[PDB]
Amino acid sequence: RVASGAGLPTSRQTTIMVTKYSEKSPITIPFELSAACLTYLRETFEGTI
Amino acid sequence: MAAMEANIFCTFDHKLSIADVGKLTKLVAAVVPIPQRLHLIKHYQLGLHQFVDHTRGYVRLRGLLRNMTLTLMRRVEGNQILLHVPTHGLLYTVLNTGPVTWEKGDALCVLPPLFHGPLARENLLTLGQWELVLPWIVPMPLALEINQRLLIMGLFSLDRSYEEVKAAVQQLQTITFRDATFTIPDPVIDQHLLIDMKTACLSMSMVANLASELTMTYVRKLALEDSSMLLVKCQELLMRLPARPQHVSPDDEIARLSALFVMLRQLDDLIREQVVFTVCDVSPDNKSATCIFKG
């Protein structure tokens, strides 16, 4: 506030309160594996070269 | 919001000589009116001078003063003035600014000044063609006389010849009260007095309509068997014109008087002035008194 002179209305005390909110954003990406890769990772490292 | 201030500081932006400040110091405990309430105000708004106008009417100035708020002056400093707003029912010391003599126990009213004597009292703070004009504080009978004179002049002005209107205004404007003589300045007849004249005419019409035959005949019947200076001076005003009352009905009389009281109050209000102070003390030089504030 600023002090005022004669004849002028004085400024009153003022209190202000506010709130800020956040946003949402999901991201996604798919990937797939062949069944052959699944069985190779599943079972034994054996057989022909 | 901002609560109304009780203490008001006034500062003159005009430069003050030592004589001006000396004059200000004498005015402590006097009543000064202001148009608006602030913690710090300029001297222009102080006093009755701001309303002095080419219209010059006493009635409009009386109307304006009624709406201003009254303050008492607390002690003075250099270039500053402190004013205090009184509260109803408390006890205060007040200064008799005007020439009117006060008495113990009477009621005081605030009223625009009316000139008296040589008319050379106007030394009050003339600076930059602004002047410290203060209202008068007067006891109730003088205010009633002033208002009554104004209203009678207004009513008489109707349909009377111009020259005899001048003569009536000349004889009515002067007042002798409590061994002093005063005269009303600028008794102009205009709309402000016209509205009061209208209300007075209405109230008188209703009073004449309501009054019972018993009330009308009381004076006429009394003169047949009483005799006194009061009565003979009383009956001189009336137009010159055994038995039993033609109609007796106390309930009708009661109701009729009940309404007639309301009409009489309506007529009374336009000459009544609100009591601002009631005094019970006096300085034996009449310069100051202690009063209870009301209104």
From Swiss-Prot, chain A:
Subcellular localization: Virion; Host nucleus
Signal peptide: none
Coiled coil: none
Family: Belongs to the herpesviridae major capsid protein family.
UniProt subunit comment: Homomultimer. Makes the hexons and eleven out of twelve pentons. Interacts with triplex proteins 1/TRX1 and 2/TRX2; adjacent capsomers are linked together in groups of three by triplexes, heterotrimeric complexes composed of one molecule of TRX1 and two molecules of TRX2. Interacts with scaffold protein; this interaction allows efficient MCP transport to the host nucleus. Interacts with capsid vertex component 2/CVC2. Interacts with the small capsomere-interacting protein/SCP.
Described purpose of this protein according to its UniProt entry: Self-assembles to form an icosahedral capsid with a T=16 symmetry, about 200 nm in diameter, and consisting of 150 hexons and 12 pentons (total of 162 capsomers). Hexons form the edges and faces of the capsid and are each composed of six MCP molecules. In contrast, one penton is found at each of the 12 vertices. Eleven of the pentons are MCP pentamers, while the last vertex is occupied by the portal complex.
Name the UniProt record assigns to this protein: Major capsid protein
Gene: MCP
Swiss-Prot record, chain B:
Highest taxon, organism lineage: Viruses
Pfam families: Herpes_V23
Signal peptide start and end residues: none
GO cellular component, one term: host cell nucleus
Cell compartments where the protein resides: Virion; Host nucleus
GO molecular function: structural molecule activity
Primary location recorded for the protein, binned into one broad class: virion
Keywords: Capsid protein, Host nucleus, Virion
Subunit structure: Interacts with TRX1 and major capisd protein/MCP.
Protein family: Belongs to the herpesviridae TRX2 protein family.
Role: Structural component of the T=16 icosahedral capsid. The capsid is composed of pentamers and hexamers of major capsid protein/MCP, which are linked together by heterotrimers called triplexes. These triplexes are formed by a single molecule of triplex protein 1/TRX1 and two copies of triplex protein 2/TRX2. Additionally, TRX1 is required for efficient transport of TRX2 to the nucleus, which is the site of capsid assembly.
Protein name (database record): Triplex capsid protein 2
Gene source species: Human cytomegalovirus (strain AD169) (HHV-5)
Gene giving rise to this polypeptide: TRX2
